[PDB]
Amino acid sequence: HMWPSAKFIDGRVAFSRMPAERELDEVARDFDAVVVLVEDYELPYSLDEWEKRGVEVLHGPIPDFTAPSVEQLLEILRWIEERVREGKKVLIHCMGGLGRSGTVGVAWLMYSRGLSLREALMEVRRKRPGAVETQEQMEVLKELEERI
Ligand code: VN3
């Protein structure tokens, strides 16, 4: 049994909506690290709630319905990879589990598997229909595709 809102895009990495504080114990049973993409005002609890449960945080705030830069994306991907190499499972989350986190998940499959944007987008949207919500989110993935 695993937290049922985790949408796995490979064996070790998943994306999701925001976990409530009362869900963190269950999340922490399977995930060692979390990439938090919401801005501080969106958090209903301190990010220390993750750390105290043994879940290492990368806070990479992106305003809702906007896109990270390609440079930010590459930083997040290396951080995920570092933890996957240690045998850890990693969760990526935003608020809805669709746009910000879907964008990072697409980027992750491109980076980790060499998938085309099309292939990676199809797989992420099979896990969460509607993932990658805005034009600018699509554009930064095209920009990333050119560079990896
Ligand atoms: O809070 V999300 O960009 O689905």
Residue numbers in the entry: 0 to 147
Copy out sentences from the published article reporting this entry, exactly as the authors wrote them.
In this study, we report the crystal structures of three forms of Tk-PTP, which showed that this protein forms a canonical DUSP fold and that it undergoes an atypical temperature-dependent conformational change between two forms. Structural and biochemical analyses revealed that this structural alteration requires the presence of the GG motif in the P-loop, and that Tk-PTP has dual amino acids, Asp63 and Glu132, both functioning as the general acid/base residues. PTP proteins commonly share a highly conserved active site motif called the PTP signature motif, which is also present in Tk-PTP as HC93MGGLGR99.
However, the P-loop conformation of Tk-PTP(form II) is quite different from that of Tk-PTP(form I) (an RMSD of 2.39 Å over 8 aligned Cα atoms), with a flip of the Met94−Gly95 peptide bond and a remarkable shift in the main chain backbone atoms of Met94−Leu97. Vanadate is anchored in the active site of Tk-PTP(form II), stabilized by electrostatic interaction with the guanidinium group of Arg109 and by its oxygen atom-mediated hydrogen bonds with the main chain amides of Met94, Gly95, Leu97, Gly98, and Arg99. Consistently, the main chain amides of the P-loop of Tk-PTP(form II) are directed towards the interior of the active site pocket, similar to those of DUSP3, but remarkably differently to those of Tk-PTP(form I).
